[PDB]
Design a protein around this ligand. Structure first.
Ligand SMILES: CC(C)CC(=O)C(=O)OP(=O)(O)OC[C@H]1O[C@@H](n2cnc3c(N)ncnc32)[C@H](O)[C@@H]1O
Ligand SMILES: CC(C)CC(=O)C(=O)OP(=O)(O)OC[C@H]1O[C@@H](n2cnc3c(N)ncnc32)[C@H](O)[C@@H]1O
Lengths: 545, 531
């Protein structure tokens, strides 16, 4: 059946709290390196991190923080945030990992979400940078509150070390992380370390790895899949600012080369962004021969994006098997599946193609064609300790090669959303099954995501019918919440105004007839040549936004 | 400012718990009449209601229910549901008011929402009809659970009367009701529900002589509170019909009003428009609607066209032209909190306010209705006694009158909160004791007028915008007569061209994307121009 177990995970081996992770890491000579620019870097050994964290701990306790208290992180500096995180670990304080707002001068969406979590956590101390404390302090006027408390981390780095680490238990909450209003994922040392240990075993991570990450530390893959995995293995890890990558994506290449990185990760959009620079890549020089692990996860992994990425960077020494698709969620401590089958020389390896007609039934393999076939990137087997299953509308187990609702069982699951019993019921189903909200199938024990529940009105059938209209070259439907309406994008064979209005009328009326919808339910939108796929360009727009 | 207090409401006056309400009602000879069909009915005096509720109480207590335990309601029959509700009041049990599922054979949205509530309430006994109990028991297979418990009301009607009522306190929970995503479980007390009853009775001057007619579901807050509980509190005669019977043949509404000489009734705006569809059948029928004095219209946007048409069409049948009363409320505030007494058949501008469509972002400017360039809204009236309404901007700052903003409510009718959801309770329970409704509107002369919902606003670059604000920028484009914009989630701007020609329409469509993308700093890809 569509139920895959990753095998036994011995979580008794190794550290049991994050304090023990930092202690064992501080015994190595490895640590962190924070990139400032192409020439300058700031180093912080794991031994220095421990002392720095103890210094910050002195200031936090001076502000009255007691073990169990939450701490609201609002950082632009990786150095200050990493240090602040471990100070909290030492003090038994619970960090709330959430990105800083794009601006603090007006009551925008990001600022509203921060207020919600801040109020849900009963007005916790906000910890931030010197470069942000002025902005963050403005929230006192935006929120019309006298309960705002802010403090910068850098001033604390000049304090005496507080060597009295609060004794933590594996089930103690280790941090909150934010996902409408965001929910407050509460994790323990046990759930995080279980993902770390599972991730290390599946990928064979070691203390000799060299890690490069520019993704936000407020993203679960930034904090757990990399930062904590790196400290747990005690390997060398290089941190870059997210802003610096999206400003100049080719810096990713420079960084992998300059530090001889062996592993890194990004969502699929970053790979597509690099592919947009083929001209300047074909006139550049990088040594990427040390890179062994480029994890691709957090959103849909597009086969043609990763293949082009491997092709473009092959002359620069990137082996064709470094890209590892992965899937995970903050609620399950980051990635729980990894695919080791993507190969530059085999576009079909680790990629599954099926007939569009069979999406609602037993999937029927096919050879990729211009139309009528869909290609999905396999995301691999569960890591040790994780069980995945695929279920139908009634939560009944499905067989393999059947698209259904993905559910996860294992030791990496959050304690739950903070202060929301009702939301915890929706996701925590009977017998330990966490409901992801994602759609996919299992094939040879390997998970493949195909969509989301919120992404439900079949869009392959709507597009096929739209393409029978003579004026339509190709089509793309997205659903859109007075009416539940589907917006039908199309390329006309001819971008002439009369021709477009004819095709638009036929699209509306031909879809209304063939599928028994109201013509009012279909909106036709007309859309040179672009090389980047449409699904890939929208990934880039939402990411850099 | 845009803040209106409805006046002081003496809550210490009158019954303080629903037990007291039924006891007083039972002293009258009035009660309920359940409509079976045109030629049949079942009657249940308030005294008989108390006795029937005492018998059901014997069955519920026989099932082990204790004071404070919830009870899941799944009813096709109003008589059984009303009796169950009061049996739970006598026993201190907390009914969970939710409509029956359209079908228990398949796993539809309704059944999922029931499981969520049922699970949230920790598997309460489900109380249902002997008619429906067969399908309800099917949830055991559909939900794949062995903890389901179901019982029928009717068999319990043969048991002895348990006259030992649990002593209730005003702040005890009196019932749960599900919101209309997954629904939330609104929890109310006798105090909050009775505060709304008392304010509503005072605003409308309801009395023991009213004759009430209601076909709306008792799982709707206006069905249980605004009418049923108001009617028991006033001790008046109330007629109950089944909701399906009305939808089957809407004109039965007129039949019932005529047959029972009803003085008050209610429905959402659609029901009035349903009747308007039947102009032909109404022109060849005969009703005496002269006793009707109060037709509440609420739960949806009140369309001036629909109500004024409705009034002209039933006037030959004796419907007075002032009977329709727009109203707004929410289950979280236990039903209506404003009533408008200004609608009139002979003056289609009374109780209605029209403005220049350009004055909507700042101080509204009154106007004379026009074919284009003006919008008109139905006033929903002053707060009932005890309620305070205010309008606020995106920073929760008070606004002046004639300004559109977020509507907030304060008063004694507010729920305890959403059951087992601290987070959602924070979102709606704002500082200074204000409840965030999620609706938009303005105050004018102390009267509330709604103009939209927050879920309808367009969010771009994390900033929020009204539909009309975008429309005014779109209007500036040459060749755009009028426009309407409706937010999209993956900006659908619908416009009328000055001249209907392909190239003329295509280029006005291009200047709408360029002019708005420029003025709002948005990606042209995000602007969809539809003619
Ligand atoms: C550490 C990373 C591997 C991922 C992660 O852990 C994360 O992304 O955490 P996040 O909570 O932020 O969001 C979770 C939601 O991202 C979606 N998602 C993640 N990976 C995906 C993939 N490979 N393909 C398609 N969709 C994917 C999914 O829908 C999921 O439920
Ligand atoms: C009159 C009461 C019995 C209605 C009621 O109490 C109810 O309708 O209960 P409900 O909680 O189910 O729904 C609440 C949501 O209905 C919307 N709503 C209600 N009345 C409205 C009106 N007059 N005009 C426009 N919208 C209205 C509003 O958005 C509100 O927040």
């Amino acid at each position: 059946p569509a139920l895959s177990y990753g095998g036994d995970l011995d979580v008794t081996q190794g550290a049991q709290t994050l304090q023990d992770v930092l202690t064992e890491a501080a015994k190595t000579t490895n640590g962190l390196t924070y990139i400032v620019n192409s020439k300058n870097e700031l180093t912080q050994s794991y031994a220095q991190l421990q002392g720095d964290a103890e210094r910050v701990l002195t200031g936090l306790r001076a502000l009255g923080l007691k073990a169990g208290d939450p701490v609201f992180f609002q950082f632009s500096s990786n150095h200050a945030m990493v240090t602040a995180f471990w100070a909290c670990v030492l003090g038994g304080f619970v960090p709330t990992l959430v990105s800083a707002a794009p601006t603090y001068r007006e009551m925008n969406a990001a600022v509203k979400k921060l207020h919600h979590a801040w109020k849900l956590l009963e007005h916790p101390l906000i910890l931030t940078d010197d470069s942000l404390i002025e902005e963050v302090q403005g929230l006192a006027f935006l929120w019309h509150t006298d309960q705002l408390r802010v403090a910068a981390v850098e001033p604390m780095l000049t304090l005496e070390r507080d060597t009295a680490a609060h004794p933590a238990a594996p089930d103690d909450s280790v941090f909150f992380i934010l996902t409408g209003m965001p929910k407050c994922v509460e994790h323990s040392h046990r759930s995080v370390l279980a993902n770390v240990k599972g991730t290390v075993a599946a990928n064979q991570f070691t203390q000799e790895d060299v890690s490069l990450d520019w993704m936000p530390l407020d993203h679960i893959g930034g904090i757990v899949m990399f930062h904590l995995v790196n400290v747990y293995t005690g390997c060398e890890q290089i941190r870059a600012r997210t802003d610096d990558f999206i400003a100049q994506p080719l810096r990713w290449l420079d960084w992998m080369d300059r530090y001889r990185a062996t592993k890194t990760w990004a969502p699929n959009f970053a790979f597509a962004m690099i592919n947009d620079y083929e001209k300047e890549i074909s006139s550049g020089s990088w040594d990427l021969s040390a890179m062994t692990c480029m994890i691709n996860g957090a959103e849909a992994v597009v086969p043609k994006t990763i293949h082009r990425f491997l092709h473009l960077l092959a002359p620069h020494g990137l082996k064709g098997d470094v890209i590892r698709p992965a899937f995970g969620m903050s609620e399950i401590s980051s990635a729980v599946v990894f695919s080791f089958a993507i190969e530059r020389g085999d576009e079909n390896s680790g990629v599954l193609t099926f007939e569009e007609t069979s999406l609602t039934e037993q999937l029927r393999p096919a050879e990729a064609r211009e139309t009528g076939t869909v290609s999905f990137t396999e995301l691999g087997k569960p890591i040790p300790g994780i069980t995945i299953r695929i279920v139908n509308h009634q939560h009944e187990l499905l067989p393999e090669d059947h698209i259904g609702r993905v559910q996860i069982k294992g030791p990496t699951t959050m304690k739950g959303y903070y202060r929301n019993d009702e939301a915890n019921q929706e996701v925590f189903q009977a017998d330990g099954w966490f409901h992801t909200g994602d759609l996919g199938f299992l094939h040879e024990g390997r998970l493949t995501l195909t969509g989301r529940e919120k992404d439900m009105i079949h869009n392959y059938e709507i597009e096929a019918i739209a393409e029978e209209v003579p004026g339509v070259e190709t089509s793309f439907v997205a659903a859109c919440s007075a009416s539940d309406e589907l917006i039908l994008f199309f390329t006309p064979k001819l971008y002439e105004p009369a021709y477009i209005m004819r095709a638009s009328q036929h699209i509306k009326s031909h879809i209304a007839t063939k599928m028994g919808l109201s013509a009012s339910r279909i909106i036709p939108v007309q859309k040179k040549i672009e090389r980047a796929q449409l699904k890939t360009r929208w990934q880039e727009g939402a990411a850099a936004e």
